[PDB]
Amino acid sequence: MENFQKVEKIGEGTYGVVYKARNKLTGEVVALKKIVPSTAIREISLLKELNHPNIVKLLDVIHTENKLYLVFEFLHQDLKKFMDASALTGIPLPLIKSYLFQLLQGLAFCHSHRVLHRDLKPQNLLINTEGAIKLADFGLARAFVTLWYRAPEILLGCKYYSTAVDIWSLGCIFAEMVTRRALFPGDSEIDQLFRIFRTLGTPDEVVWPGVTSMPDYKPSFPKWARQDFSKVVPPLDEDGRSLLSQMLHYDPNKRISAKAALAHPFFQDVTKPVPHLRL
């Protein structure tokens, strides 16, 4: 741990502070997350094995007196900062498609290994000058503030939710890159749920079998009609809107999986363009 030279504070992470640091020994530049229950220890040691080009590599795990340090590979920018930077112009479709395709490959890999992210958002999707995008903070939820990307089943109190929650979050992120505005900017759990309801329609037994039996479901929920989908992400083409609606299906079991999503016609002409970053 004294092998590290804090270069600067990247930002307030979800589990602690994250610093950009230099390994005094190897000289390598990394991201330091200053986060303990032995259960967490075995859980994150398992994440060390979860290696994929679209998953931010966890280089090491350092435990020392209640202090838990996670060393990750460092990327210079996150998707949230990139979106704001191209908010006036907009991220070209080719790049949006490339990014969505890569994240899906990443999710497909994690999910095949029964690992869920559970809290996907623009701030934990990291990019580099090479046109690569990666998932950061994967598996950390299982081990141990925004509700905008939270799947409805979680909001309705489902305690044993599946890999579909990541597909839903990614669907919200996909829509956000296209429109340049968060899809469902909830500022409370009920406001988050109702914003979803107002756009996709209040779910019922017809479209989501068993929904009315969910823990926090209330028969008193207002009944909103589903809105035309062409008003949600204009001017995305039909392939895109088709893929998005399948990523946002209410019923977690009907929601398209990452693997299947990779076969959707929308990615028929997928390429790997590079973004222009001002580091």
Ligand SMILES: O=C(Cc1ccc(N2CCCCC2)cc1)Nc1n[nH]c2ccc(N3CCCS3(=O)=O)cc12
């Ligand atoms: O963030 C970044 C980009 C970045 C780089 C510099 C600043 N700076 C530096 C100081 C000057 C202002 C801009 C702010 C953000 N890179 C990461 N590489 N590896 C990571 C591992 C975890 C995290 N996380 C941080 C919190 C959530 S997380 O996914 O665990 C980030 C990176």
